[PDB]
């Protein structure tokens, strides 16, 4: 029980903090993140010469540093979907040849996770996307309705029903290359926040893909998905802890400079105690983040700590974005204020990787509640 980072971890962390200011779809910034090592952080050298093979804590701590120093949160979010919803299920359940095929470019080519449908969001138990096997190939059919990185994706990790009778176990996970005929993609959705992370409808119209693109055994998809959500819900939300620290830093700096009545506004407890509560929720959220990443490296059930962390972090991020605007007044409501992006992105964060309601369902479950 200690909260000390190694010399090497502190150095990687300040390296992430320094990298922030070196930054349609911002392909240049995305490539710069690849060069920094962002998509390679949890990948072993065995599968990518620029993989880092870091443990979960070093990973999330670097991501936390990127979230603090990079203003384009949407871009970090896109890169983290790619790495944790796609690269990791490939690392953990792909054949050895598919791993050597796909990962070297993934660690550096873009991937998108596709499970949500028109009638499947919080409930992914009855997917309308089907995969019939024919000989050495699978034939995929159905639409996926909210694919992050859809328009820029070279590969889709698709979850489809292979056997409606096996229910929770009747689903398989595939890696569908872009360039597989039958794929069409809608234009990027206009949405509240996160403009740099494309969100698209993808339709699969008789997509024929070779057996070797399937992830794990047939019928394993629902648990492969749960395993990728354990990565996304744990590690992606490190971004938002970094962003909250920047938020808090800007509110401290502003409240100590902005004056109303030849007194600085921090002298009002309505302002200062509001900022205090930002720091309390942040330290709470950061600590729950660290705790969840540690348990994940420990071989126990870590779902409760991960659901808690995603909840605490995402809800704190929403409160952080409201409070940041409240502290800055009209300045925070204006776009040049450079402040209202937090609330716009944070409201996404209580939806994807499963809404706050669904995290609590998980928490209840792991607590023993029938």
């Amino acid at each position: 029980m200690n909260f000390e980072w190694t010399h090497e971890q502190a150095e990687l962390f300040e390296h992430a903090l320094r990298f922030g200011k070196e930054l349609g779809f911002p392909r240049d910034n995305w490539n710069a993140l690849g060069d920094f090592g962002y998509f390679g952080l949890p990948i072993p050298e065995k599968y990518a010469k620029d993989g880092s093979g870091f443990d979960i804590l070093t990973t999330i701590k670097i991501i936390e540093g990127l979230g603090q120093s990079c203003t384009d949160t949407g871009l970090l979010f896109a890169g983290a979907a790619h790495t944790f919803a796609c690269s990791m299920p490939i690392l953990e359940h792909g054949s050895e040849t598919l791993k050597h095929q796909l990962l070297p470019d993934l660690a550096t080519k873009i991937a998108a996770n596709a499970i949500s449908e028109a009638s499947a969001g919080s409930d992914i138990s009855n997917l309308a996307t089907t995969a019939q096997k024919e000989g050495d190939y699978y034939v995929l059919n159905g639409g996926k309705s909210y694919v992050t990185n859809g328009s820029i994706a070279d590969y889709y990790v698709v979850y489809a029903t292979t056997n409606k009778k096996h229910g929770y176990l009747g689903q398989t996970a595939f890696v569908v290359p872009r360039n597989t005929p039958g794929i069409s993609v809608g234009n990027d959705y206009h949405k509240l926040g996160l403009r740099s992370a494309p969100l698209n409808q993808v339709f699969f119209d008789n997509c024929t893909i070779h057996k070797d693109y399937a992830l794990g055994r047939e019928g394993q998809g629902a648990r492969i998905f749960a395993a990728s959500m354990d990565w996304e819900r744990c590690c992606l939300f490190a971004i938002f802890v970094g962003a909250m620290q920047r938020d808090l830093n800007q509110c401290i700096e502003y409240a100590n400079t902005r004056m109303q009545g030849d007194k600085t506004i921090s002298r009002f407890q309505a302002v200062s105690h509001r900022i205090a509560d930002m720091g309390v929720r942040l330290e709470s959220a950061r600590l729950m983040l660290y705790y969840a990443a540690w348990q994940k490296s420990q071989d126990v059930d870590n779902t409760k700590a991960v659901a808690m962390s995603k909840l605490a972090i995402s809800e704190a991020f929403v409160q952080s974005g409201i409070d940041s605007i409240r502290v800055h007044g009209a300045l925070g409501y204006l776009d040049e204020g450079r402040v209202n992006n937090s609330i716009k992105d944070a409201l996404g964060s209580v939806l994807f990787s499963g809404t706050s309601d669904i995290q609590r369902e998980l928490i209840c479950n792991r607590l023993g509640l029938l």
Partner: protein
């Protein structure tokens, strides 16, 4: 295993657990937990499959 009837449902050995939705993502956790306390068995990942979890009889078999 009236556990499935009280704890998970609030049925016999041939009721299809997967086909009719009794074992999902959440109920599985409760079941795997009960299988560890009552029978000491910790079902490895590889053997969670529709053969063994077709119903109570097939499930008891694997235990």
């Amino acid at each position: 295993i009236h556990f499935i009837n009280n704890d998970l449902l609030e049925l016999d050995q041939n009721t299809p657990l997967l086909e009719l939705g009794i074992l999902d993502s959440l109920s599985m956790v409760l079941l795997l937990a009960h299988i560890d306390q009552q029978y000491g068995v910790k079902i490895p990942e590889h053997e969670i499959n529709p053969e063994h979890f077709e119903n109570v009889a097939t499930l008891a078999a694997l235990i």
